[PDB]
Amino acid sequence: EKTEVVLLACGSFNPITNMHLRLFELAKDYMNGTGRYTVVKGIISPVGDAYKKKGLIPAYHRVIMAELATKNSKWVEVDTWESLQKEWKETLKVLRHHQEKLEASDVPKVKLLCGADLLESFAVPNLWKSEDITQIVANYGLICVTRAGNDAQKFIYESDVLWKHRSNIHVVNEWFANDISSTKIRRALRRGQSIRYLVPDLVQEYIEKHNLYSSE
Amino acid sequence: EKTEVVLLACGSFNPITNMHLRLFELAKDYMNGTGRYTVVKGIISPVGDAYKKKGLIPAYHRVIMAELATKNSKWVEVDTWESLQKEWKETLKVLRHHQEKLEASDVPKVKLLCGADLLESFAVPNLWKSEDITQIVANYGLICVTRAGNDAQKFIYESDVLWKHRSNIHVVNEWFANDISSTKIRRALRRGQSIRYLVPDLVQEYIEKHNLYSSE
Amino acid sequence: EKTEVVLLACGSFNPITNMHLRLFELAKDYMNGTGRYTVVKGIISPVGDAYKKKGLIPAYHRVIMAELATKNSKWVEVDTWESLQKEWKETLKVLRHHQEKLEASDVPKVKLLCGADLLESFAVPNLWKSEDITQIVANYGLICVTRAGNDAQKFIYESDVLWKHRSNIHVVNEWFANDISSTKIRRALRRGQSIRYLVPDLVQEYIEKHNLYSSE
Amino acid sequence: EKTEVVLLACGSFNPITNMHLRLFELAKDYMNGTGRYTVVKGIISPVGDAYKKKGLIPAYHRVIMAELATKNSKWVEVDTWESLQKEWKETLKVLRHHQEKLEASDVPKVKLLCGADLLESFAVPNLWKSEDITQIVANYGLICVTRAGNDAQKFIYESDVLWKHRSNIHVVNEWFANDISSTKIRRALRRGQSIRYLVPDLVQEYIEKHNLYSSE
């Protein structure tokens, strides 16, 4: 009688590393261990080229490396929809897009998989529209996997919009530190350092043959 | 016995309009009317895709429209060098690049063609390195065409680096107002307005068939 | 066959002066001289005590002085609704409130009467929600009476949201300067100066007997 | 031969909670245990309605709840003087007001009862006039009750004005954490949570029957 859930992670995956992959396994173990849910699929959805940030490499590369990272996974996949659109899409739209897609196979609920960082982001003074925060939290749900869940709970308590919808945010503890951020990987790469065993062997091979992140 | 000069205009040309084209004819008429120079070629050099700004469309489009804009001109051309490089290039490098290229045909002096806007830019507190300003002004020269030359002269008087090298900056008056900025063209385009007779007929046709700048 | 319009002016009226009264007569003359409208009533609606600004005196005073200011007017009145509510109300709600009230007398269109100041305000970086600006302009309309309509038109041209809905904003010129701002009246009053013949005789009498704005 | 002292606490009491009440008992125990003083009365004096802050409810409510909070206390009382004045009063004036009042009963010294927060406040760059800080500290005295007295002592050491007059500031440790801030109470209340046993039963009853702080 459990609820069927799909896990959706947006982001830049620039590049993807073991840490993003671990977040999925963590979150599914947790959800399924509530006794209240059954996790049915996960989806990585990298941001597109319209988001014009510096250091952000062409989507097609970031899509590959994510596909390499998940080739053997029974349950997590990459969807290129958002990377394809000609104008940049807001997470709330990416979410609606993926929920409507499931309803069209004639019902599993999508939920946004994030870290605390999202919560921090949500409270930066003018940055988000309260009503957009409300729709995400309230219509979908958050699964916040983090090594600082103690910070996580505090942001929830400090925001009325989050507190109001708290029964729909799940804070998940990571007891095994593995803080392998894209930013550190890129930093290591432009210094010529090894990144072996922080990202999947094939993702490391792709980065090396294409000399990515080596430059600046 | 006059000095041979080449006119180099960097920028985004996003898109090019009658105003940029007029700047060249203005500046050559002036230079050649000093009695001290003979203008020998001009060069438009659009910025590349590494400069990641919002609203800045792919170089290849901006290169086309500039080539359409100058197809009939006896003396002005487009060079795609800077648009091609994989990392963004500073104007001082674009300049050295084009001077060295002339020296390799076995001597004409390149000079940077700009408006006041450049001068304004040069004095923004932390924005430019004094030594880079010095090399441009001093090693190459500026030709500042503007409708406000009165502002132009003032920025020169207010900056030691510019004043020092003033004998190498030529302020050129435009007595015929034709302030057709890219920014206004894009604004008009995303409101569905005509831009006929502010840009060359062929540049207007290209923009229309490709639906550029229509979106946001 | 003309359209019936109601003129609604929100604000603090702190206090009301001849200038606010003149804005109504100006705007009606204009509207009625389009040949396209007939102005049917005007409404002054002072802000409430929830808006807690400094220098803003209790609503009941500001309501009186407005009622004194309009006692003899055939067509302009004061509605205390917004001043009465326990929580501060946004202009878009005040607007909906007054439109729905007319529809309940079984159809005249309300329009917001403002000056340029509103337009300036609309473009301050984070200050307004684009969608709220859109509803006001688009669902109601603006009548902008000003001595600087030249600035007015420019703000319209500079904002996509305003430009989009321009056919619904009427910029009205005042050829008779009478810039009697509340701020100047209060300033004069706390210096003990006369304000006779800048506000209606009765409003001046009320302010004097209650020693308002004399203090700080 | 001990000195007779009166304890004066200014503030918003919005609302009062067990924490403010505890500060008095703490400070008297301390003073009286110096062997150098005898505490003779305390006074809560809520700020007035001229201070126009958001969330700050009408004085009369805040005066009640403080009177309910102290009805059974042998030694602490509420004085409504400052709440009554038509213009907002600075603490230094409230202080002079209360000292002169004692001198008029034909001599006990008033002292300002505060937390560290005051000290933090005193050093914010432009916020206080050095000479006002000097008069308070020097003419009256501070009794700083806090759970962080370690921060307290540091602010004293970091400010010349405070250090100079240190012999007149008493830092009091609270070994029993009871951080029940008004801000947290209001937050709890607008989420419908219990605040029972963080404020006196009667203060809780008043807040509930008047539905205070429930709104926003």
Next chain:
Amino acid sequence: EKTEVVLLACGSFNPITNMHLRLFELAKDYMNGTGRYTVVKGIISPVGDAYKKKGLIPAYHRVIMAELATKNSKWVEVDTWESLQKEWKETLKVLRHHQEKLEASDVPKVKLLCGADLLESFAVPNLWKSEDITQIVANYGLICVTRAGNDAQKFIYESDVLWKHRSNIHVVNEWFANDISSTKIRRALRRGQSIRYLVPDLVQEYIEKHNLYSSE
């Protein structure tokens, strides 16, 4: 029966130029032409070395050049008092110092001679203490000589403290533009330009023999 006045100009005189000298003759002509005063002496008082600004050269130089500038004047002199003190002195103290000195010759009123610049300065948000502005204006008086008296009057109207004491501020028009600022002189000097006939011949000679302001 006229009032006897002394004119005191503080500042950096870095260096002094014809413009400062002209301000005195202007202000005396004006005062004496009121029919209400008789100007009896003027005093230039350069700031000291404690004021540690960049570009500000040692007092002794600035004292010389002022003494050279006034050697032939029947009525204006230099007083080195403020330049001598070991700690920097505020204008209000310099003023009290010079008034008390006159009272000691057994009564002429000192008045501060300034330009608009002072008025501008007086209103910069946190910059001056209202009470210091009050003492200067009110206890001494201002004589504001300027080419923009129209700006002058406006600052007076915009500040309550100034407006209150307006009967004690005299705005003096200069109908002969001679804007020879220290800043422009120094700028000219470090570019090797002539400053002949903008400062007294002897001041120009001193600057030249000591190579002042030539450097940076």
Next chain:
Amino acid sequence: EKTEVVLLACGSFNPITNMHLRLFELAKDYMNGTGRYTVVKGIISPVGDAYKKKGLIPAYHRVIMAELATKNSKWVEVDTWESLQKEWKETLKVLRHHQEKLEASDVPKVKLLCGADLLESFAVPNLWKSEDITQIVANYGLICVTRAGNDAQKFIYESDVLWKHRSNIHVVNEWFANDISSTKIRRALRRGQSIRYLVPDLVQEYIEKHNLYSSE
């Protein structure tokens, strides 16, 4: 076969204290205990009077107190060169100055002796020119003695310019806390407190007889 090194410490020495003296002995012990170097001389070089900071007393005083502080040291000395120059000198020039001086005695390498504070400083957004940081680190070397070497290593890891040249930065731990900053000494002095046994007896005597830092 070890490398011969000279230790150069720039700064204000305002005043010098036991802490600066300890930094030298610390750094030499460390260098010499690498087995790779031999420390041959150290040099304190106080900043000059052109650097016009507030609280910074005349160089000649700061030069004395440093000479008193080192009179008995076999190996550390004061060089007044930089204090003497008429324009303020950048550390990179002070460095080149001292290296060239050694090369002129017909080869020991100078190295900059600093604390973390330098590293913090190096990363403040616009503060240093990357190329100047590069020349110091790369052409000379840093010896960073600190009680927080853990912060030290982190700044190194966070800056590409530092990381690139890390093999040339030596982070030295101080296991004996002795944080006697100039700022604390001056603070103590203007409160009339003892500073005995935080600075050399003779430096303390000089400060006392000249009443330095007593004022403000």
